């Protein structure tokens, strides 16, 4: 077919993200050319239509095929596609978008700096943290604490913040000065902690954070970064009491709080930001993904009042800040951001994420809460996940070599449903577009059920369950 | 005016690249809202029209106002704006663009990996170098040598590669494992080396590189990164013999070569790549800017055959590579890339850059070669620069406090010419669009002369010459 001819051309020329590079180049690993889509559906080059239960990568939040966004980009392209935004230069969409972002983020947020990826936004965060402490005369106050199973990007420094092995192994990461405290992941607590409640587990996490700060010396610890809800690390809502306990420790030691809102931002869990939902009061916020629904690459750092004041002090002392990306503030990116945010507001998609997301949780709990392959059903808003187990009542894990998670994802693909096998475990993840309806939730759940049942039967017959 | 009211809105909400953040927020530093443009001209919100002698930031290479590129973006947006390109997934523009990129880069280049900025492409390069040596069982062979005054981006690791103070000071950079050898900058050689010819200075640079490699231990040195011609570090063509001597040293010690083509790529110096012009045979190539002429954010890493072979070996051993950006391979970015490259080909812009670029060099030499303020006139292709001096014959440098470079750039702005004051010196830089005609060169030069003469008269009167 034309589809396979295109794949075979691609094998000769493209290094793809998260791909078995040898097997893809040599024809053993599969490819797929995506060609269209509308709503929650994406279509491949053969015309095969899938329900995209993952919205790309937690990002096609307003759905596919938004002509309205294409027209917004085009109107701006016929005026000015690009000029730099260095040294006080701007474009009108960028100015308007900064206003809209700050309105959504709320009081306490001061300014926006633009990039193109969540990874580059976290590079910017790290430079800000270093500059902040140098300006304040605290040259040792520089270490940054992330968490096991956090996901913060895929570069050298941003990938050091990430707490997943795939982004460190063979790359000599993390770099110096980046530390990892406990995964905020109750279902993975040790067997010895079976009896812990969520709140006791949160207390344990806060105690370990405080111990880390004290062992390192509080005068050396600058910042803590966390997603409100773990995304790529497993779609894991925080345990009861977690954010209140963590914030108390950070305040005790004057440690900055960076909320990584790349997944949770702009409606994903039923609030404007995950920080709003969980009563997190960050000093700095990372955004991307749902900022433009992926129609253009755009990222942001939202700088709070406290840090901004010190950025003013530093530039007063030392001059213009030594930071910039050529495409920072790209007018077409900002035009897409404006159109995307206007659609979210006009269509009430944050409320749909809250209400239909609650329905998603209800349907997943009903369908999978007593399934013999499912150790945990979890989620919040338009995020959900199923973590598989050979013995749910014991929170047992499968031998990773059985590839249970990947196999369930592949079985879902055979039901024409895209749902992601999450890394470092056996977990089927869901992050559907925020336009998803209750009827579409029912169809996603029904297809997922057939896929989980199929792999359950295979594992029964092979003696692995 | 409406323009200043827009700027004043922006002062309250946006952190700009390379901006005096305090003075801009408080109304004491200027802004400018850019709103339109066609060809070599860019227009602000008041309708004031400038010749952009810097093509944005060395990047609007096919000129402003290309409705053809807007239409290509729009056509693809009506099909599919975005799906991820992870795990062997692709889109048709991405496949086509990989083929076109490799055709231009030439034999020996094998694959393309996509990002959004030159900075993120150099993050990828660093991960590749680490992975390569770990797979080969050389865990110690990891150091990366860049050069003083090189520019490789503005992140943590990418900014560590950069060899300019603004991207290090107050940020605690460079990170460990990154070294800086001699600036490839003949006019800045020490007074103790006044008598060196360019070839002698190149031999000196190669000797200092060998000295560094031997002092570090060759078994600990993994790679060397360089722009063929320094861009942001001063618009500095390499001295005669430089790339021949450096490449011999790198082969002698089994050090990989990364050519950073973000500025020189896609016609800027009159060849498809700067490496072609200077007979550089790199193992890895970084690309951005002229890849899309800034119409969409897009970057690339081009991986050569020998590095690709080890990426295959490593993925064969360890599985899919732990690297990805959400927006890698964005279909609208690749569509703009294809339209941009087709325009460069159809209009013969690489040849224009060679031919009209040579004319630019001649005009700059004739107008400024004996100008009392100009210590050096230099350039190649469509890159040119004037470095100012209080005594050209001594290669003397101004007290930076006089701000000669910034003053000349501001005087050029008063002639409605954008030409950049380069960092860390008194240098007026030029990187006009590759469509620039000979008559446009004459007008650029004439406006620059008026600006240079104005500041010369000020400094003559004040006794600073
Ligand atoms: C040589 C070189 N490398 C890297 C970069 C970084 O490009 P980016 O600004 O898109 O973040 C630039 C600009 C550059 O000129």
PDB file of C-alpha atoms in Angstrom, chain A residues 17 38 43 74 103 106 124 133-134 168 178 224-225 234 279 326 353 368 371 403 428 435 458:
ATOM      1  CA  UNK A  17      11.186   9.717  19.629  1.00  0.00           C
ATOM      2  CA  UNK A  38     -11.799  15.415  13.809  1.00  0.00           C
ATOM      3  CA  UNK A  43      -7.215   8.745  11.014  1.00  0.00           C
ATOM      4  CA  UNK A  74      -3.550  31.942   8.874  1.00  0.00           C
ATOM      5  CA  UNK A 103      -5.985  35.967  34.171  1.00  0.00           C
ATOM      6  CA  UNK A 106      -4.664  34.075  39.118  1.00  0.00           C
ATOM      7  CA  UNK A 124      14.153  28.315  31.869  1.00  0.00           C
ATOM      8  CA  UNK A 133      19.620  32.891  44.536  1.00  0.00           C
ATOM      9  CA  UNK A 134      22.729  34.501  43.067  1.00  0.00           C
ATOM     10  CA  UNK A 168      18.568   8.833  32.644  1.00  0.00           C
ATOM     11  CA  UNK A 178      19.308  17.641  41.066  1.00  0.00           C
ATOM     12  CA  UNK A 224      11.186  21.665  44.566  1.00  0.00           C
ATOM     13  CA  UNK A 225       9.367  20.817  41.321  1.00  0.00           C
ATOM     14  CA  UNK A 234       1.595   6.751  35.917  1.00  0.00           C
ATOM     15  CA  UNK A 279      -4.595  24.258  46.799  1.00  0.00           C
ATOM     16  CA  UNK A 326      15.129  32.571  18.666  1.00  0.00           C
ATOM     17  CA  UNK A 353     -13.593  17.986  32.042  1.00  0.00           C
ATOM     18  CA  UNK A 368     -12.762  -2.350  36.391  1.00  0.00           C
ATOM     19  CA  UNK A 371     -11.582  -6.972  37.456  1.00  0.00           C
ATOM     20  CA  UNK A 403       4.792  -6.757  28.785  1.00  0.00           C
ATOM     21  CA  UNK A 428      -3.050   1.656  30.680  1.00  0.00           C
ATOM     22  CA  UNK A 435     -14.592  17.725  24.356  1.00  0.00           C
ATOM     23  CA  UNK A 458      -4.151 -14.946  27.162  1.00  0.00           C
TER      24      UNK A 458
END
